[PDB]
Amino acid sequence: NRKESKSIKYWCLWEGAQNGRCPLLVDSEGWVKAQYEGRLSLLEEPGNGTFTVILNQLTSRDAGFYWCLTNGDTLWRTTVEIKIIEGEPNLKVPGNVTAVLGETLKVPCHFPCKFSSY
Amino acid sequence: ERIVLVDNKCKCARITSRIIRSSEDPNEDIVERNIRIIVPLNNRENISDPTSPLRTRFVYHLSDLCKKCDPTEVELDNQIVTATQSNICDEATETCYTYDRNKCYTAVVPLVYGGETKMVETALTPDACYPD
Amino acid sequence: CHPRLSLHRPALEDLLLGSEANLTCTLTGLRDASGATFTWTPSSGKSAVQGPPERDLCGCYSVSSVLPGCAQPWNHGETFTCTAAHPELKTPLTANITKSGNTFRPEVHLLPPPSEELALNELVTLTCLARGFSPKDVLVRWLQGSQELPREKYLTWASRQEPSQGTTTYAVTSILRVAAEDWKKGETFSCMVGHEALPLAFTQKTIDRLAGKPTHINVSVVMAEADGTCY
Amino acid sequence: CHPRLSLHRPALEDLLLGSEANLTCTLTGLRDASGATFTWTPSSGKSAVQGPPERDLCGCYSVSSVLPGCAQPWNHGETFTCTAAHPELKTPLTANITKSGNTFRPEVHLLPPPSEELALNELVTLTCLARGFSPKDVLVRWLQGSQELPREKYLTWASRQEPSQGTTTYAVTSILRVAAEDWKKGETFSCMVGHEALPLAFTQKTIDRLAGKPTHINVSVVMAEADGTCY
Ligand SMILES: *[C@@H]1O[C@H](CO)[C@@H](O[C@@H]2O[C@H](CO)[C@@H](O[C@@H]3O[C@H](CO)[C@@H](O)[C@H](O)[C@@H]3O)[C@H](O)[C@H]2NC(C)=O)[C@H](O)[C@H]1NC(C)=O
Numbered sequence: 112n113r114k115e116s117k118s119i120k121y122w123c124l125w126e127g128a129q130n131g132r133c134p135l136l137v138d139s140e141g142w143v144k145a146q147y148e149g150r151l152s153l154l155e156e157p158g159n160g161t162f163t164v165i166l167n168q169l170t171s172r173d174a175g176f177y178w179c180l181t182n183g184d185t186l187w188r189t190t191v192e193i194k195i196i197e198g199e200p201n202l203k204v205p206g207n208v209t210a211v212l213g214e215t216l217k218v219p220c221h222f223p224c225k226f227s228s229y
Numbered sequence: 230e231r232i233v234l235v236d237n238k239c240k241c242a243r244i245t246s247r248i249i250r251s252s253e254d255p256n257e258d259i260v261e262r263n264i265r266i267i268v269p270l271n272n273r274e275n276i277s278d279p280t281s282p283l284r285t286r287f288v289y290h291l292s293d294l295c296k297k298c299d300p301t302e303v304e305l306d307n308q309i310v311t312a313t314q315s316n317i318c319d320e321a322t323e324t325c326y327t328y329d330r331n332k333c334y335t336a337v338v339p340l341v342y343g344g345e346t347k348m349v350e351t352a353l354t355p356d357a358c359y360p361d
Numbered sequence: 362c363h364p365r366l367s368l369h370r371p372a373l374e375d376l377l378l379g380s381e382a383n384l385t386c387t388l389t390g391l392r393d394a395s396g397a398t399f400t401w402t403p404s405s406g407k408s409a410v411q412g413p414p415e416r417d418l419c420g421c422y423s424v425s426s427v428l429p430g431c432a433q434p435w436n437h438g439e440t441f442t443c444t445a446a447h448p449e450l451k452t453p454l455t456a457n458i459t460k461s462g463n464t465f466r467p468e469v470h471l472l473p474p475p476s477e478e479l480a481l482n483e484l485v486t487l488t489c490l491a492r493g494f495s496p497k498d499v500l501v502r503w504l505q506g507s508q509e510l511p512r513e514k515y516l517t518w519a520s521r522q523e524p525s526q527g528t529t530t531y532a533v534t535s536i537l538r539v540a541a542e543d544w545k546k547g548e549t550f551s552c553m554v555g556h557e558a559l560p561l562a563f564t565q566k567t568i569d570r571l572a573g574k575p576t577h578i579n580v581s582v583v584m585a586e587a588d589g590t591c592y
Numbered sequence: 593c594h595p596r597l598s599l600h601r602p603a604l605e606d607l608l609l610g611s612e613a614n615l616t617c618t619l620t621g622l623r624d625a626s627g628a629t630f631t632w633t634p635s636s637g638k639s640a641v642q643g644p645p646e647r648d649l650c651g652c653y654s655v656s657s658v659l660p661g662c663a664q665p666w667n668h669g670e671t672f673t674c675t676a677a678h679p680e681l682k683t684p685l686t687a688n689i690t691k692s693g694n695t696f697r698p699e700v701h702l703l704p705p706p707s708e709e710l711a712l713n714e715l716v717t718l719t720c721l722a723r724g725f726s727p728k729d730v731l732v733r734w735l736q737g738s739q740e741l742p743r744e745k746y747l748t749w750a751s752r753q754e755p756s757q758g759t760t761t762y763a764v765t766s767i768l769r770v771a772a773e774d775w776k777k778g779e780t781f782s783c784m785v786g787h788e789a790l791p792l793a794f795t796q797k798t799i800d801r802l803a804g805k806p807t808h809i810n811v812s813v814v815m816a817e818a819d820g821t822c823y
């Protein structure tokens with residue numbers, strides 16, 4: 112809600128084991144879970160009605176139901192389902208890049224041609 | 230009277246429909262279509278004040294009532310494409326027959342204040358023009 | 362015999378659903394399949410790799426090439442200037458290509474099935490007719506519910522030009538046969554059409570059994586002296 | 593160069609109307625000059641015309657001739673042997689042409705106009721459709737009342753085959769655009785279809801207004817002093 116813009120934002124993952132539980136994964140104040148290191152972050156843009164969250168390096172066990180929740184007085188809780196279907200990633204990067212001791216590195220990253228205006 | 234096909238507010242018309250299926254003789258069923266028109270007997274032709282007499286002729290075309298143009302999303306192979314849903318809504322120019330309860334309508338009238346004249350604004354539906 | 366040079370446009374399918382607008386450049390009418398060099402005037406990703414000297418009139422030489430490069434300049438109206446310099450001629454000759462103007466956008470219509478075909482309870486036909494478009498390229502896909510049907514379940518004809526009401530326009534048709542059980546149950550079917558003159562490049566029409574000819578019609582006209590606000 | 597397989601039957605557009613049936617059978621493969629040899633095993637008073645050659649793949653030639661034998665031997669089942677000979681290798685794959693079997697009839701539907709075009713007062717459009725016939729030869733004509741329209745007012749696509757279950761069948765469409773004043777007068781229109789698996793060689797369908805009219809109409813007028821609108 113626009114009238115609650117000074118809130119604190121959270122991102123759950125619905126466990127469904129015992130009765131139902133939110134382990135929190137990332138907050139708007141600078142904390143993330145341990146096992147989701149390097150693959151999760153919360154972003155404040157575009158703002159004014161909406162925030163976004165980025166989750167990459169997917170695996171087929173990452174499917175499930177996910178919750179988001181604010182800190183204000185009126186709480187909409189919104190649920191989205193992440194499905195996993197098979198295919199190929201658009202952007203293309205190498206494997207896990209090492210480093211030399213005493214000289215430079217360079218790492219490439221392609222993109223296809225529908226992303227030519229982005 | 231079960232599934233709403235259109236509920237239009239510039240012309241104030243509503244159309245529902247329903248399949249009611251007999252089990253005997255499966256070659257023939259019946260499909261119902263209900264139309265409701267509400268005719269305003271005291272509106273002008275253009276919506277300003279001094280325009281013209283009472284509108285006395287009311288014309289409804291079914292292809293312009295049911296017209297749907299806000300875009301949609303279609304998934305073709307693994308892609309999300311935006312499509313339009315109609316041929317005919319080139320941008321308004323539609324003549325409305327009634328007011329709409331969630332939009333507000335104003336007019337501009339010149340009056341005098343001793344010296345020169347101003348450009349006073351006037352509400353035509355006062356329930357909906359409250360500035361908040 | 363005679364050597365000539367011809368230039369084809371990019372296909373419609375990879376321009377809309379993708380963006381990779383590979384071009385081509387064909388000369389035919391030679392018999393010595395080693396000497397050929399091509400030249401384009403805009404060439405930043407210049408590595409245009411030539412194609413195989415494939416079959417011709419009883420196994421003669423006929424060679425072409427491909428320039429990669431995706432679909433941002435083609436929509437703004439650039440130009441491309443392939444020329445050939447083979448040794449079986451004493452002249453380099455050139456043609457060009459440009460995204461054409463003077464275009465019109467099509468009008469799409471879906472037609473409900475015929476009445477006599479529903480009385481037999483076997484299969485029913487849906488027809489998709491698109492009309493009045495100025496280039497000669499179009500797409501037609503079909504969908505069930507929100508699921509796209511595979512391409513081998515429907516038949517699509519070719520694009521031809523219609524009788525002249527002054528300026529030239531074209532037409533195309535397509536049919537799809539579905540089971541007469543889920544038509545009467547109430548599933549929905551869509552016909553989608555893609556063409557270059559439409560603003561969002563796509564348009565859709567959806568039909569089902571409720572949005573067709575009804576058997577019964579109830580009309581209720583209510584006269585309202587009260588107000589003109591339409592609650 | 594290399595000999596191939598080619599076929600040419602009598603024309604249906606002259607077989608259903610007149611009796612000017614001409615047989616012309618083909619066998620090509622061009623390396624040598626005129627070494628002409630025939631097979632016309634019924635030759636009962638026919639003289640085969642021959643003429644000049646025409647253009648081919650830069651040097652080659654090909655030959656054929658015509659027999660006017662329309663005394664009904666073709667729709668009986670004569671086999672009308674086609675077999676070449678030359679000072680060359682005496683191993684042909686041969687052509688033996690007859691009226692074919694396992695034939696099916698077409699099923700013809702004629703569709704009404706879309707209601708979007710009616711409410712604009714311009715030209716309106718009609719659609720003919722036939723599907724399910726076993727050889728791919730068909731004729732399509734239009735009528736207005738009893739007058740056959742000239743065949744440059746309407747567009748007809750080709751004849752293509754369908755996705756199916758075992759048995760193979762074909763389909764074809766056509767359209768005709770008329771003025772809305774002629775539709776709203778009450779003038780009728782018709783689509784005629786010719787095919788050789790039909791017993792009388794023709795079928796018709798006819799359309800106008802008042803064809804898909806509904807059979808029940810309820811009109812209730814609610815006066816003043818009785819408004820009871822619900823949200
Ligand atoms: C129905 O009536 C309304 C009310 O008269 C019409 O709207 C207004 O029509 C006037 C007359 O041309 C337009 O005048 C313009 O006003 C501006 C000031 O805003 C002035 O600077 C211009 O020089 C010009 O005189 C005005 O654009 C227009 N719209 C408004 C005020 O929002 C309306 O056009 C009528 N509709 C029909 C179909 O007759």
Ligand SMILES: *[C@@H]1O[C@H](CO)[C@@H](O)[C@H](O)[C@H]1NC(C)=O
Pocket residue numbers: 440442455456457
């Ligand atoms: C482009 O084509 C036009 C007409 O075909 C002609 O001016 C010439 O062949 C080409 N001109 C340029 C500048 O490429």
Ligand SMILES: *[C@@H]1O[C@H](CO)[C@@H](O)[C@H](O)[C@H]1NC(C)=O
Pocket residue numbers: 671685686687688
């Ligand atoms: C006609 O030629 C074909 C070519 O293979 C052959 O299969 C067929 O048997 C021939 N007809 C007769 C009657 O021999």
